[PDB]
């Protein structure tokens, strides 16, 4: 629930919690568009626009982030029972340093149960993206997007790989 | 039709034109999400992701932009003949330093044809926004968005004020 500000925010609506770029904030409530949060710099709390910050929590704790996992091992785990079309995970890339890959299981009308891998390109200043059409500040935001919409992938990210 | 590359971009698809952040390019064809461009640096030509660039053109030529225009003259110049609901223009914020203000003519029931003002806040990295909801790399992108959708404003920015 610890986010980081991508931009600075000047209070506009009575009740807003202003903040500077890179400032640390802990989120208290997720009222859709505005989030109640608290500054780890002034202790003062209020509402902040959600697209001005990004989850800064650790990656490992994520249900879908299996750092040390091989391209092949992922295919083995994804096709394992207890998972289905839409199951996925992200692993530390093994075809590009400082990179990540997205593996997801989809269903083919030819080969049958298949597993696709998408290269998660890194952006100029710490950003991420699979399609230049949409970029994100962090892997957390990237997943959130593709779980609520298969925008580009012929498969939506339903459930993270279940060991 | 010059643009500046907001991020670097390595060629993903055959026919793609790769470029580094800060480079300027000339837009040849605007094919929806993939535009046809020429590097002003190498002379090379290719397709680029439209969301990776922003208009580098000047603000003067723009029909909707008026450098030194008072706020009173905006209201007068706007309710004048030749303009209607949806007419707008942007001028420098007379109340805030280094900022811009959006003035558009709307309509109220008990007030009639009125003139609303919205301030364009500056984003840390130089972008802009009227609403924290959506941010823009530049003013051109901001005008474009709102003329194509009343995404918050009371009306879509229909026509740029006419002298």
């Amino acid at each position: 629930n610890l986010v980081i500000a991508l931009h600075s925010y000047e209070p506009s609506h009575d009740g807003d919690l202003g903040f500077e770029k890179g400032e640390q904030l802990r989120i208290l409530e997720q009222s859709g568009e505005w989030w109640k949060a608290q500054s780890l710099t002034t202790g003062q709390e209020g509402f902040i626009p959600f697209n001005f910050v990004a989850k800064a929590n650790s990656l490992e704790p994520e249900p879908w982030f299996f750092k040390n996992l091989s391209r092949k091992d992922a295919e083995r785990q994804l096709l394992a029972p207890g998972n289905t079309h839409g199951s996925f995970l992200i692993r530390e890339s093994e075809s590009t340093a400082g990179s990540f890959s997205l593996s997801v299981r989809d269903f083919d009308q030819n080969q049958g149960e298949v597993v696709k891998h998408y290269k998660i390109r890194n952006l100029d200043n710490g950003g991420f993206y699979i399609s230049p059409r949409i970029t994100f500040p962090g892997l957390h935001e990237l997943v959130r997007h593709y779980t609520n919409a298969s925008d580009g992938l012929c498969t939506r990210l339903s459930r993270p790989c279940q060991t | 039709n010059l643009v500046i590359a907001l991020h670097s971009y390595e060629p993903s698809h055959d026919g793609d034109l790769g470029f580094e952040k800060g480079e300027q390019l000339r837009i040849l064809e605007q094919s929806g999400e993939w535009w046809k461009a020429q590097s002003l640096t190498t002379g090379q030509e290719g397709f680029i992701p439209f969301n990776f660039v922003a208009k580098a053109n000047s603000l003067e030529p723009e029909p909707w932009f008026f450098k030194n225009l008072s706020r009173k003259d905006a209201e007068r110049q706007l309710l004048a003949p030749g303009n209607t609901h949806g007419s707008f223009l942007i001028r420098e914020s007379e109340s805030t330093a280094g900022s811009f203000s959006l003035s558009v003519r709307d309509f109220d029931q008990n007030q009639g044809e009125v003139v609303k003002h919205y301030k364009i806040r500056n984003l840390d990295n130089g972008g802009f926004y009227i609403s924290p909801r959506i941010t823009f790399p530049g003013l051109h992108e901001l005008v474009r968005h709102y003329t194509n959708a009343s995404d918050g404003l009371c009306t879509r920015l229909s026509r740029p004020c006419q002298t």
Binding site: S95, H117, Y118, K119, I130, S131, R133, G152 | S12
Partner: peptide, 5 residues
């Protein structure tokens, strides 16, 4: 190798 959008 890899699949695209």
């Amino acid at each position: 190798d890899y699949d695209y959008v």
